[PDB]
RNA sequence: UAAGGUGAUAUGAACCGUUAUAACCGGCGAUUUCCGAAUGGGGAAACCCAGUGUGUUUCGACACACUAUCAUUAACUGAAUCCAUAGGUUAAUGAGGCGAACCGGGGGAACUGAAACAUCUAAGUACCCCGAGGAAAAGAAAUCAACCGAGAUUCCCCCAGUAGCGGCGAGCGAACGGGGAGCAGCCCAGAGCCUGAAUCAGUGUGUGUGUUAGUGGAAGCGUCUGGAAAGGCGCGCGAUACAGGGUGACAGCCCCGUACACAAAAAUGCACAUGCUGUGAGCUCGAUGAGUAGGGCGGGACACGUGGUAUCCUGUCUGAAUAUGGGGGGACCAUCCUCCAAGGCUAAAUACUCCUGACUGACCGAUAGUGAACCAGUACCGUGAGGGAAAGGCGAAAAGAACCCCGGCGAGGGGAGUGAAAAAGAACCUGAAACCGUGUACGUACAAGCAGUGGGAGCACGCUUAGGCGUGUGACUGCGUACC
């Protein structure tokens, strides 16, 4: 429902990640907003004995929340509220206040 | 003297049984207090 | 009736500030109003007129 | 086809499909002989179409 | 609309689907594993079998269709009885099933403030029973008065706590008089002339505009400190938006609220404009349903609790007159007044917030608040009939022991570590209390008397250019009985 369309580019800037930039993003309902996966060093579950126990210790789900920066472009995180006009007849996608649509 | 708690089926047409409980009215009030209003269920139909 | 009214001669320097009527106010930019409050003074300490 | 693709038809599957539809759920149904790497649980995730027919039926007879 | 989703709280895995039915919101409609509230009859709640039909079958049978008690009107039918009546076989239709509570019917206590209890108060409340709708009970004057008068009813301050009754006891407790709120009249008992003319129960249509989707919706940066600066300053801009709390904090600055502009399928609010089925309108002339009342004695609620007696009641019984009056004038009757013929109908004022919707909080901030935060009327007692708990709460991201090392292929720690934190580690609360273990030094295995505060030696330790102090069990013994 969110009117801006899942090909996008963001970052975090909500927490001590602050700068770190991607795109598209992993999105479902209640979905915590995961940017491109910008974990640092976290493990993973090692319940199978045979020969393939998962060594990973990175992108697993990392969250900062709906979205801080209404898409990058080269700066600045707003209006995300502003809603637009016709461009698909059913639906709605959008950019931001100074720039119509995508 | 044999004390006391028992199960069975065939003794609770004139005390426990779940139709008189709404046949009578001193019953009916108790049966919504209990689960229709109070939140709750019985189930222990058998 | 009832001498409650009578405080403007104990404060009489500062305070029931005696100027005109309400009419000045914008109001859709009611943020303009401290520049216009300077005849009172006041500009937003209490936002008066009686 | 989820029903809803195949409303065009003269007749409803009462008329025999009621059964080519269900055989699956006590013949292949059983542990893995209808699929280990392909099919598994089919009944809700595609084949639910024929439940439909059950109002749809009820619906028809009365218009 | 805008894209993702499979109601979940092991998510393993299928499989829809970002083209405009993947789910899911919403109008209306459709769904039967058997009970069913349940209803052919049976009931020990989850029925176990009667009846008679139907489309059709590999012709086994089948999934399915329908019935009852009543209140009320048609049709057929029918007794001990020419007749009467009663009772069945159908035809139609709706209610019987279910609410916390209001409200109409009456009941309805025991003891207990009275210092005694067989008046009363208690108490018209516990409940139990019966009605039928969201509003009711009411209400169209045998009403209240002094001759002035008032108008269904009474309401609201009064007058008044006045009149007014009593084991002369504790309680109960009016009306008139004044100001007001109010501020309008019909229909049968029935014929005529008139005749879709006034209303409303329904049932379709259009607007005037609801119900909610869809439409929306505000400001900024640098720097010293910095896990998040969303603090501080700067004002570089801001205001009918500075609720409240979320986002890891304290964010005018991002918010989500407001303030404001646009707009729906299709039933359908209510106001009207209408339309189809049904109602009664206009104006004369007719019209008048007493077992009703009276008493004499009972039972009575009435301002009047037994008493002389007061109605409008009520019950065994008895028993008139049509307004050429008497039923009654809160003792009884004058003088004389007012209702009115005993059939039916009325705008306003009152209460129930089922639950969910708008705004205030010298109100509840888990010793509580609707039994209610829960998912707690749930489990720890119940022959049970069911009384209902001990009980608020990790917290960026489940970021929920990567990894190493020992041991019982264990428990727990010693470092790493996501981390501000493990003094947030899944006997999830950022956190003393009843009681405890190893220890720095005491007093010390001849003990007395709330185990003392004194008066002081020097001792585990500490400061001092040396300066008698900053520290507690407590050698000597003095003082005593700390309570209430």
């Known amino acids: 429902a969110a009117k801006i369309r899942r090909d996008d580019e963001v970052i975090v800037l909500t927490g001590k990640d602050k700068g770190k930039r991607g795109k598209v993003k992993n999105v479902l309902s209640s979905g915590k907003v995961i940017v491109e996966g910008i974990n640092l060093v976290k493990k993973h579950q090692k319940p199978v004995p045979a020969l393939n126990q998962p060594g990973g210790i990175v992108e697993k789900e990392a969250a900062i929340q709906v979205s801080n920066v209404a898409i990058f472009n080269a700066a600045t995180g707003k209006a995300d509220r502003v809603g637009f006009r016709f461009e698909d007849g059913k639906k709605v996608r959008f950019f931001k206040s100074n720039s119509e649509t995508i | 003297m044999k004390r006391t708690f028992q199960p069975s089926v065939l003794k609770r047409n004139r005390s426990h049984g779940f139709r008189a409980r709404m046949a009578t009215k001193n019953g009916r009030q108790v049966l919504a207090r209990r689960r229709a209003k109070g939140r709750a269920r019985l189930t222990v139909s058998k | ?50 | 086809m989820k029903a809803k693709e195949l409303r065009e038809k003269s007749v409803e599957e009462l008329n025999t499909e009621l059964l080519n539809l269900l055989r699956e759920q006590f013949n292949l149904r059983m542990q893995a002989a209808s699929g280990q790497l392909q099919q598994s649980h089919l009944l809700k995730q595609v084949r639910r179409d024929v439940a439909r027919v059950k109002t749809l039926l009820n619906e028809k007879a009365g218009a």
Not at chain 3, 17 to 33: G, H, M, N
């Open chain 3, 1 to 50: 009736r009832g001498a409650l009214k009578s405080i403007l001669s104990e404060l009489v320097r500062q305070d029931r500030l005696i100027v005109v009527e309400k009419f000045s106010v914008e109001a859709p930019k009611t943020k303009l109003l401290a520049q216009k409050l300077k005849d009172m003074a006041l500009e937003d300490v209490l936002i008066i007129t009686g």
